[PDB]
Design an enzyme around this catalytic site. Sequence first.
Site, short mmCIF file in Angstrom:
data_model
loop_
_atom_site.label_atom_id
_atom_site.label_comp_id
_atom_site.label_asym_id
_atom_site.label_seq_id
_atom_site.Cartn_x
_atom_site.Cartn_y
_atom_site.Cartn_z
N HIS A 184 0.78 -1.26 0.00
CA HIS A 184 0.00 0.00 0.00
C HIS A 184 0.80 1.30 0.00
O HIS A 184 0.18 2.39 0.10
CB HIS A 184 -0.98 0.05 1.21
CG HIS A 184 -2.00 -1.04 1.20
ND1 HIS A 184 -2.97 -1.15 0.22
CD2 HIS A 184 -2.20 -2.07 2.05
CE1 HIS A 184 -3.73 -2.21 0.47
NE2 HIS A 184 -3.26 -2.79 1.57
N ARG A 197 -0.39 7.29 -12.88
CA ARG A 197 -1.55 7.16 -12.02
C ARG A 197 -2.65 6.53 -12.84
O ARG A 197 -3.82 6.82 -12.61
CB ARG A 197 -2.06 8.52 -11.48
CG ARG A 197 -1.10 9.49 -10.76
CD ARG A 197 -0.82 9.23 -9.28
NE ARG A 197 -2.02 9.27 -8.42
CZ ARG A 197 -2.39 10.34 -7.73
NH1 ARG A 197 -1.67 11.49 -7.82
NH2 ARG A 197 -3.48 10.28 -6.96
N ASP A 198 -2.27 5.72 -13.83
CA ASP A 198 -3.25 5.19 -14.79
C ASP A 198 -3.25 3.65 -14.86
O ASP A 198 -2.64 2.98 -14.03
CB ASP A 198 -2.94 5.80 -16.16
CG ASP A 198 -1.53 5.46 -16.67
OD1 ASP A 198 -0.76 4.70 -16.03
OD2 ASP A 198 -1.10 5.95 -17.74
N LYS A 243 -4.95 -10.10 -7.27
CA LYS A 243 -5.68 -9.49 -6.20
C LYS A 243 -6.81 -8.60 -6.77
O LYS A 243 -6.59 -7.87 -7.72
CB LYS A 243 -4.74 -8.66 -5.30
CG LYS A 243 -5.41 -8.10 -4.04
CD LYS A 243 -4.37 -7.45 -3.05
CE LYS A 243 -5.12 -6.93 -1.81
NZ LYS A 243 -4.24 -6.08 -0.88
N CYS A 271 -6.40 0.28 -7.64
CA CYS A 271 -6.28 -0.60 -8.84
C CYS A 271 -7.31 -1.70 -8.73
O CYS A 271 -7.26 -2.47 -7.77
CB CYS A 271 -4.85 -1.24 -8.86
SG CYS A 271 -3.49 -0.01 -9.00
N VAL A 321 -8.67 8.40 3.97
CA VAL A 321 -8.48 6.91 3.95
C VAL A 321 -8.85 6.35 5.31
O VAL A 321 -8.78 7.09 6.31
CB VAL A 321 -7.05 6.49 3.59
CG1 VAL A 321 -6.69 7.01 2.17
CG2 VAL A 321 -6.01 7.01 4.60
N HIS A 374 -3.63 -2.67 8.13
CA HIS A 374 -4.66 -3.11 7.18
C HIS A 374 -5.26 -1.86 6.51
O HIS A 374 -5.35 -0.78 7.15
CB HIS A 374 -5.76 -3.89 7.94
CG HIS A 374 -7.05 -4.08 7.20
ND1 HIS A 374 -7.18 -4.96 6.16
CD2 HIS A 374 -8.29 -3.55 7.42
CE1 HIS A 374 -8.44 -4.93 5.72
NE2 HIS A 374 -9.13 -4.10 6.48
#
Length: 118
Positions: free
Chosen positions: A12, A20-21, A39, A79, A101, A112
């Site tokens: 993370h 950023r794509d 994932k 993603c 967040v 987590h």
Amino acid sequence: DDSRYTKFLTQHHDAKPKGRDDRYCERMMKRRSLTSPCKDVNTFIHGNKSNIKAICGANGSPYRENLRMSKSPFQVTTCKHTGGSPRPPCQYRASAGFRHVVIACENGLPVHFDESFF
């Protein structure tokens, strides 16, 4: 070292992202070994590590029973797996933004990320 804090950084944290794509997501999920099996959803948080750790102290507030919400937004890239194959190659679509967040902390450290908040 299989500490939950180390695993959180591997999955993370990317301080200075190259893009950023969708192509950034396909490259980074492979580089962090998150593609066997694919994932389903994974967010990278940008910027410095110190600001993320401070969510576990004075820069976060309790959220529901056992989570913590940031007091300020962060640059993030989420993603999301497309095509429904658990088997690689793993295709991804990106969603970048500047968002609060929600994480879980243990012993003062992030352990987590709550993907369901977005």
